[PDB]
Amino acid sequence: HFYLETHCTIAIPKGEEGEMELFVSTQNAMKTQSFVAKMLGVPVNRILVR
Amino acid sequence: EMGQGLHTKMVQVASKALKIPISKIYISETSTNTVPNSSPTAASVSTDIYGQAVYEACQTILKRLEPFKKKNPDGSWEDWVMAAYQDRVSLSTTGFYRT
Amino acid sequence: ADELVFFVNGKKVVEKNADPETTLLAYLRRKLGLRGTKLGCGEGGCGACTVMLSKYDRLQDKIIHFSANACLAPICTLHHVAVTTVEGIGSTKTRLHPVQERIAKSHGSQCGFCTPGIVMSMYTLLRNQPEPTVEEIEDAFQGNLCRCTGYRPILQGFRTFAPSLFNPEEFMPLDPTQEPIFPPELLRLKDVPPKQLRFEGERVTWIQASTLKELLDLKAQHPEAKLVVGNTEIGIEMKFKNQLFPMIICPAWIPELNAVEHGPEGISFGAACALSSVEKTLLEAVAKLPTQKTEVFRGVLEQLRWFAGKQVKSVASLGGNIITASPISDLNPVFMASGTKLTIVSRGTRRTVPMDHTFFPSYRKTLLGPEEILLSIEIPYSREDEFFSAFKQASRREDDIAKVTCGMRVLFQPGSMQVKELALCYGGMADRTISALKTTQKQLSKFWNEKLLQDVCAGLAEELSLSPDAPGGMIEFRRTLTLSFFFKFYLTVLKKLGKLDPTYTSATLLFQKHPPANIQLFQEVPNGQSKEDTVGRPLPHLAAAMQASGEAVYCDDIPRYENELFLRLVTSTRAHAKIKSIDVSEAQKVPGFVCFLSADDIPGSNETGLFNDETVFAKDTVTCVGHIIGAVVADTPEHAERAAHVVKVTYEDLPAIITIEDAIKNNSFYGSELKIEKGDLKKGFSEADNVVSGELYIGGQDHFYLETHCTIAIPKGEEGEMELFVSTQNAMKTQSFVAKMLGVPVNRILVRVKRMGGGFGGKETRSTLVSVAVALAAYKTGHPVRCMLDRNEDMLITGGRHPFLARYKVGFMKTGTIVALEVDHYSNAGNSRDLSHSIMERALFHMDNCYKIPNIRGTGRLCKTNLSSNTAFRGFGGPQALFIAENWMSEVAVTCGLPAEEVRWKNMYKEGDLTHFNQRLEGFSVPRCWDECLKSSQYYARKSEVDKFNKENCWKKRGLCIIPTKFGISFTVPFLNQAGALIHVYTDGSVLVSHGGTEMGQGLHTKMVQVASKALKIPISKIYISETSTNTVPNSSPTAASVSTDIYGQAVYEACQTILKRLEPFKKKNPDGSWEDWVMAAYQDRVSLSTTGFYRTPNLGYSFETNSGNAFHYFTYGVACSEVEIDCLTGDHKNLRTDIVMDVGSSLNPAIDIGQVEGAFVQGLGLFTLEELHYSPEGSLHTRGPSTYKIPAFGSIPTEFRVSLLRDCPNKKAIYASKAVGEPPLFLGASVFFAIKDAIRAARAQHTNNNTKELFRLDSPATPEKIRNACVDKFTTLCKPWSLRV
């Protein structure tokens, strides 16, 4: 692909109810959200992807 | 937005639908807590589908503003919006499209 | 510099560059990332920063655990000490400790900001005593404050350590064997010889002296060196008194300074011993030695009962209190009167002298030389024929500064009543501890009799005089206390010499705590209701566990960006003046200084405020002390603070208008008169049998939310975009005010509110003062910026409840029936309009309370003054008007000579009546609440018991009063009664709910989660609410008017319906499927799982012009009965019992609603009896901290506290038949005020006069000063024109 900007993610752990806010260079915020939730083992509503 | 100008086009669409300058419209970002279960931005259909969703949401706004426009035809967009707010009419809505 | 080594939660910490000025709180929060411990006042009076400290005591060869305020603990005093914070005992990520579990499940946590501190006070107690008594449990919190709960649930939940809202049987038992162990490494270090340590900071050098020899050499070389042990004085001087001590010597480690010796003359304590140690030793001594030898010890112990709290007493040293020599020291008067011996030393010298009047030559000075230090103190045993007494009276019993405090001793000739020695020493009557020598000397060789009592009182009145301008004011009260204390001493000695009149006995008793009794009654949910349907059940606040664990994130707990700067506001020191110039040349020298911002830096508009009558930054003129002139931005909070303090502003004073009286005299108002008039007054007064006229005043109130105002502003650098995290109930106005100041479209600004550690109306608008200033700083620097106000800044700048002045005239019949009423209200609004108008409207809306008044006229006027702009405070004007109403109603009863409850009842509205603003009262439940409260409180039976007590007691009286209330539900501003919600169902079936309301501790999100769960028919575990944000729900009204549940509940409900309709087709095609199955099917069929919900309260719109239209959607009602006991000699009082019956319709959550009732009730109790703000004549606020502003404490609540929610009273006007509960209960606190007034009448009938129909004025708050002064007697009287017309 050689997108000038390579893959990148910032993950912010809240410390409350498994909440995590992420800033990601992706075309798929949905799958990013569910995949991160699946790995953490928390409901999808706890994950915010921006 | 990955450089293809999707937000520009959506602002262009919203401006045409609402019939107001683009300068009054803004798109800041994409987030899972504003629009959920979104398909990845792909298949070159983003303009097609999000354009329709934005279009519908705009239509819902116009309908809610219609009574106020009719009562004050020579007023400004700002006048109608404020009147709507004070009359406790919601100025927030979703839009959706399915090919 | 030596390395500082200590432990935090078992983890070793090595600080190679310890700064002497760094507090443990700052270190925990900024260096260790442990944000569970909070900053609530920075002056040791709130306990929000409480932590536990553990160390190996060399002299006791044992590990000791004690609590301490992290805000006053210099980390430099913690070498080889083990710290335990809330995070160290448990968490929701691992497992909650029993203390955390119980306070959470017992509903002892609302906003949650005070929880960690209280959790640690309780934890510390249990580490010292695994099975404490109820007494010990209550005493554990003398230094912890809570503004939300009303304390009852916290005490009741913890009492377990010694339908229903909670079930104790579910609580995990406490098991000491599983507690974290004392760090092994520290236990090894105990075997290493102590060595002197040196720490070097930016401005201070700290020397930890290991031996007495090193201490004396250090003092010989540096006589100026300031000693520090507990730092509970030095810390205050450094933080608030602008003091800087270049060199500090901490002698805490020195054995001689910590030694305890039992001698033949008394018990000696090293000057470094903590007051808690002295207290422990004296208690043991009092239990083992003959009563006749412990007279002085018991005096010391009585003062220690009311000396700060556990956190301060565990670190505060003896020497510290003695040498600080404060005018209001509670110990020096006792040490002086008892001639306690002081052993003073310096390198090469040593002397021992008994403390006497000469030891304190002048203000803050003692007779010690510059090279000397106090080594030890010997508290004497009392001898035969020797008696002692110690008394203290303040504004609040617990953790307060003495108004007058004393030590009194008398020595008689062997077996006689003939005085040999007499010492009466007082604190709080001069700029130093003094002895009434002139007076006492005249009694030597005299006998203890009535004549001596009279002579001493007259002597005291003349010798302890106070000039009208005496600092602290309360001239009459203080002088009266000096005589009253002696009277108490006099009677007490007669008793000890023994015959004493039975009605005088109680005057000699020391405060006695009575056992608590609490009962909460509510209604069980329908028999067949599903377990997953939580509406109507006492579900604990969803974040309570995280608040008890310190994991709950509040604004400042959010991590700072590496490049984030800090802002400190620069405010006016003048009430009204022109700004001639501003010089920052000095501020520019403070390290880390970045810039000074002012009006000229604003890119958009400097016009702000609800009514556009305010400035973001003062321009040309300042109109109140605290008026924001500009702000300093620096790399650290300290640097910003220090720089802002040296910014020099040159002023030129302008005529100022401070008081309501000044305003009226100068015709200084905002807008024109407000008024509601119905009927024919002239006719009404013409038919009345009696007419009463009067004036009444009610003081203001500071919100004192445990978490002060705070804002973080992140500038994006793109298109003017800015993202802010704010502690506010109004994200919408925050957003538009920031946008207006920046000159950018509102759609560029994002405001996010997670939760507030309290709001109470104080964050409805005034939070913008900070938010806008921070946004400007972020805009100008391009860096993220933040600012959290210190308590003193918050209390000075942000405004509070509106003080009210009322002039009334009521006409009534001999039967007590009201026929006419005219009331003119005046509120002190401050330097801007803000919410003052709407507040006055609500006041006028409630001038009737629950009474039908055929002919009535009420006016309101907003006074424009040079004081910070006052704003919304739980009640929004209602409490003031309701208070004024009950005042004249009480005067009508007395005038008529009829039982107050009879007069109130016969004047009460009836189902279907119209109010003075012509709204029909439908479903008027006051009658039911009234009868049930009269019955459950056993009002009548107790009424006779009160009269009996008053006949058997001359210097103590009891009062009983039952009052009702009604509160109109809905914003006075029609268009604000709107609410929106946004709901998303993700593909795993989990639901994310978002609405316009914010969480400030009232449990709104919890209730909304409960509502969504019921509507969707799924467990609450599948629903979540993360925060409130302007980009999910726009144009939201502030979370206020107690209608958030009502309106957001409907919006959430409507959004859920839409979801159900969309899922219906898939549910039908697969009836046996799960929620998850239907959700996934909808998604794959391309059916949107996102929708909005909206609600608009119907038919609202009252007009003060036509006195027509619906102002409210419905009314919330309640009744409260309270009993008190007053000390006619001191002004102190006890809230014996309170019974409340509240109608909240079918409660959505009885646990949260009872918590709102109890909490609102305690804030009202505070407004009417304890809380008072004092201002200089020039308009400068004196009370800027918990030390001087006394809100209710754990020990302030009714000992017997009963609350019942009216059963079977569904409200068809709101979501699931519930009713708003936030503000309605607050006025009920007035029942305590009127019970007090009832008691004062008893006291006046006893000593003042015989006019059983006399109407004496009693303004609010009924503080100890007002109560004591009202109890006119021979003493108040003791504390002459040429001619007089005949």
Place this chain on the structure above:
Amino acid sequence: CDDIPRYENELFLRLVTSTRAHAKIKSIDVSEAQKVPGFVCFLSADDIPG
């Protein structure tokens, strides 16, 4: 994404990837990595909570 300011306590992650096309992982030794200044931790499969 990376232009977003880092929090003062923000840490950095570096992936550890396979240098073989197909093989069994016999063991992982981080004793050397632990010596690098600023090292915080090595994460692997077992650390995943979900």
